[PDB]
Design a protein around this ligand. Structure first.
Ligand SMILES: [Zn+2]
Ligand SMILES: [Zn+2]
Lengths: 162, 287, 286, 278
RNA sequence: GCAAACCGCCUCUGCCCGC
RNA sequence: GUGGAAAGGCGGGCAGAGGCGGUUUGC
């Protein structure tokens, strides 16, 4: 039922928001799509709606957990400032992506309790893309990263978290 | 009737946020993850600033209330305040009557004179200007937007925090239950370079329009700017660089013929203080 | 034949697409500035004696537009015989409302061939509001003002047949004067300004007894199939009288045209351009 | 008679958000090119602001300029607004609809007034055409590319109106151009008379020097102007240029100079060949 | 031996007047 | 010898009022 609802591009934006308001159906079918996101190790794997397709499957599986946005804001504001540097200010984020990897690593080194799984799945997804972004350009192939990371947070408000 | 021009008294300097400043915006401008209630920002450089609208209106807000305190003491020195009585048009929804706050903007009553020559004798509406039907007196000060000064540009490059997030929690008294929210604010100690240009039109009354602009400045360092200042967030401090005059012969020649008053180590209560006439005595030697 | 297409790459809005009466008057004022009075009388004697310019027409990136001939409408059901009548009727109606044609579709309508209208006009007629502010009280008084706002590559151009010694002696030095002043309209707000380029246009036209006018006509004899245009401009603040021109694309037979000189109380005589720009056309029986 | 066309190129720098409304999805839109959607500064909002600043400049100096410019002797400083009679003794003498502008009534007087000789006059049996052409300033190639790169070129700013007693907030929105933008302006002066063109260039630069300390359009007194003229080149385009077409115009060189390093800093120096060829 | 729970925004305003 | 000549979409309007990063009790 959930796998047929979770279709290819935009299978059920209106449908998954009703089902996420569940336990056994989304613990498996979104786990395959979380594994499908990790199997797409290249960040530039989706010129089409598939960035908008992965992020709906990501933010539906994270909304099943907690995922407080307040915990992530140190990473989220850091992604805002590095994109602000790309506007003719700097061109090397490698001196600060390591900080953004460290702030991602410090956050899961803090997030302990019932909210481990809300940050373990969040740890699983961005880091194979941060592996690619180490040896990448920053005007291109980081443009597709930051737009993916917006759509994760954006649908997370629509599915009812934060 | 009879608009003239003699020059532009320019008041530069810096604005020191001794306590952390919060001029709020709205969000949703293609922005996704951020602090709720953000400080407004220059979209090209990314940095916060202070609008001239937020500073010209706040100086108008404090000075209109200063004049409403004394409608029997300024009327010996200015005409047309005898048309107004202390109060508001809130108990009677009629625009122009004897009450001193007379214009319903949308719902808020603000002292704006309805005519040219009524506003030409008003101490507020000749410094801040007025709108009206058939009169429309315009202002004589322009207050520009204040961006970060050039050294606080460089601290943003160095990675120092130009903003911060203060979390304030409201607690219900009966159940002691917190209702937490996070407010972005400019870091305390930050500094913004401002600009107030007075436009000298009538040489009979220009002492007063600087003595009233420096009165509202001293009322603003006693009050707060932006923010939730009853809970801390205000505390502006004006640091002057230099008064300048810019005579009419400047704009025609191009030579630096401006009369440059120096208050590089003085205070806003020290310019209004004994020495006003010691500092502006060469302006009167030029007129 | 072979015509010299003088293109006018715009640098702002216009006031209208220029016609031939308000191109020749602008070329007249441009010659008097850089040469003087004795060359303007020589310019007028060159147009009567030899070839003449046409009206201005739009283009949009190597698609030179030309006016639709009026020779098609009494044929316009015989042009579309091989069409099914439920779509032939709305094709016939949009074919008639059309004002311009391409450089290629013009050569089909001169031969009574099936042709297609263009999809897009290269400009717009927007209404920018201005205001008149009081100098003391800043009181506003809105009036409205209309313009012609071209696209990214679009512009306007006219055509020139004539001897080359008259072109590079008179028409070519006048069009660079007019690149820095206007062609009509509020030239002080930057309207009639442009950059001029010179190219070559070649039109295939059938040799016949009839002809279409690519400029305003002011005919001697009564034409065959026409369309009235009624305008009179201004000359040094003097109001010209309205003159029944003929719009472009109208059909004449063995007509040279002819300019009318006017008085208007000035020092010099004012010539008003009404020479025709004949291109051969094929007609039905009237 | 025509002698040449002094051509003034440069850039307009919007140091602060510039708003030139249209009143027609933001509640108060700045005007825009309908085909690109990009904002621009008109040639008519720039010229009427160069003129409104310069007419108040002449209004203060009617008495001191009676013997450099005639027909300033027929004007008294002030408006003709109270006594509703046009072309009266006062200065701002022509009512258009509800606003009073200095426009001189005849050709014989507009050749002497410093405003109307440079900016033009309507009159009855007069029609004095202006000598300057002010083009529409459009965004520089560097700022059209930021439109291609997906940036925002016009922000939207929210103000509020607050009661002086109960602090009832009453907001509205105003679209304005993002501060920092670079426009490309163009002013083409028409050398009709060969004697008084220095006074017509030095008056035009005075109108621009007052514009760098006043605002351009919009709210302005709340800080929406703050413009800056960045000159690139002045060119002469002589009468010999238009006849034969050969490129021998006289070009001044000022890459980074102000409006006040240009008025007298180099005025004897930058116009040295133009004042020689006349 | 050290924590783990919940709360993460609430509720009033939003273009006027003038050609 | 130009359906032309003259003509600032702008005058006034604080993104503001209220709000302890808190209390509870165990596994
Ligand atoms: Zn008042
Ligand atoms: Zn005049």
């Amino acid at each position: 039922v959930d796998a047929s609802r979770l279709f290819g591009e935009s299978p059920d934006v209106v449908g998954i928001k009703k089902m996420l308001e569940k336990g056994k159906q989304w613990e498996a079918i979104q786990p395959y799509f979380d594994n499908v996101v990790r199997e797409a190790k290249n960040f530039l794997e989706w010129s089409p709606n598939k960035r908008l397709a992965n992020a709906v499957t990501v933010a539906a599986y994270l909304t099943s957990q907690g995922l407080k946005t307040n915990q992530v804001r140190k990473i989220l504001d850091m992604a805002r400032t590095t994109e602000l540097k790309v506007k003719r200010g700097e061109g090397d984020i490698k001196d600060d992506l390591v900080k953004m990897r460290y702030l991602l690593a410090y956050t899961v080194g803090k997030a302990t309790g019932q909210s481990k799984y809300s940050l373990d799945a969040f740890h699983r997804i961005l880091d194979p893309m941060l592996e690619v972004l180490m040896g990448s350009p920053k005007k291109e192939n980081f443009e597709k990263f930051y737009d993916f990371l917006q759509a994760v947070v954006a649908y997370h408000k629509f599915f009812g978290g934060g | 009737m009879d608009r003239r021009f003699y020059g532009k008294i320019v008041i530069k300097g810096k604005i020191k946020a001794v306590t952390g400043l919060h001029i709020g915006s709205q969000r949703d401008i293609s922005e996704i993850g951020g602090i709720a209630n953000p400080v407004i920002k220059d979209p090209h450089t990314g940095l916060p600033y202070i609008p001239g609208s937020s500073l010209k209106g706040r100086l108008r807000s404090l000075f209109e209330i200063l004049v409403n305190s004394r409608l029997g003491e300024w009327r010996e020195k200015y005409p047309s305040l005898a048309n107004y009585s202390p109060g508001s048009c809130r108990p009677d929804n009629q625009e122009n009557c004897g009450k001193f706050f007379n214009r319903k903007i949308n719902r808020g009553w603000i002292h704006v004179c309805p005519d040219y020559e009524t506003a030409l004798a008003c101490p507020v509406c000749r410094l801040f200007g007025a709108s009206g039907k058939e009169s429309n007196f315009p202002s004589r000060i322009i207050v520009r937007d204040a961006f970060l000064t050039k050294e606080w540009e460089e601290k943003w490059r160095a990675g120092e925090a130009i903003t911060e997030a203060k979390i304030e929690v409201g607690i219900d008294r009966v159940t002691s239950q917190a209702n937490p929210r996070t407010n972005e604010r400019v870091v305390a100690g930050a500094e913004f370079e401002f600009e107030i240009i007075y436009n000298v039109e009538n040489t009979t009354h220009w002492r007063d329009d600087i003595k009233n602009l420096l009165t509202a400045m001293a009322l603003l360092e006693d009050s707060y700017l932006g923010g939730s200042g009853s809970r801390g967030y205000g505390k502006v401090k004006f640091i002057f660089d230099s008064f300048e005059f810019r005579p009419l012969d400047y704009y025609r020649t191009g030579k630096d013929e401006d009369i440059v008053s120096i208050d590089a180590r003085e205070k806003s209560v020290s310019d209004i203080l004994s020495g006003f006439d010691s500092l502006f005595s060469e302006v009167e030697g030029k007129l | 034949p072979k015509f010299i297409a003088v293109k006018l790459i715009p640098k702002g809005p216009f006031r209208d697409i220029p016609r031939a009466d308000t191109l020749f008057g602008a070329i007249g004022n441009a010659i008097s500035a850089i040469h003087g009075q004795s060359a303007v009388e020589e310019l007028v004697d060159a147009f009567v004696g030899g070839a003449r310019i046409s009206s201005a027409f739009p283009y949009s990136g190597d698609t030179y537009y030309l006016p639709k001939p009026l020779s098609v409408e009494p044929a316009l059901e015989g042009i579309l015989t091989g069409l099914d009548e439920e779509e032939r009727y709305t094709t016939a109606k949009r074919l008639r409302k059309a004002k311009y044609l391409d450089l290629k579709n013009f050569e089909l309508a001169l031969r009574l061939r099936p042709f297609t209208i263009p999809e897009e006009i290269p400009y717009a007629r927007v209404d920018v509001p201005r205001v008149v502010l009081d100098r003391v009280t800043q009181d506003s008084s809105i009036y409205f003002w209309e313009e012609i706002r071209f696209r990214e590559k679009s512009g306007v151009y006219f055509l020139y047949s004539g001897p080359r010694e008259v072109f590079d002696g008179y028409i070519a030095p006048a069009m660079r004067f007019l690149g820095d002043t206007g062609i009509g309209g509020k030239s002080t707000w930057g309207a009639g300004l442009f950059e001029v380029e010179f190219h070559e246009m070649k039109i295939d036209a059938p040799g016949s007894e009839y002809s279409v006018t690519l400029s305003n006509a002011l005919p001697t004899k009564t034409p065959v199939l026409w369309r009235l245009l009624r305008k009179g401009g201004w000359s040094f603040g003097r109001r010209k009288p309205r003159m029944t021109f003929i719009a472009e694309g109208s059909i004449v037979k063995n007509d040279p045209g002819g300019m009318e000189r006017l008085e208007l109380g000035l020092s010099h005589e004012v010539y008003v351009y009404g020479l025709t720009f004949p291109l051969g056309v094929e007609l039905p029986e009237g």
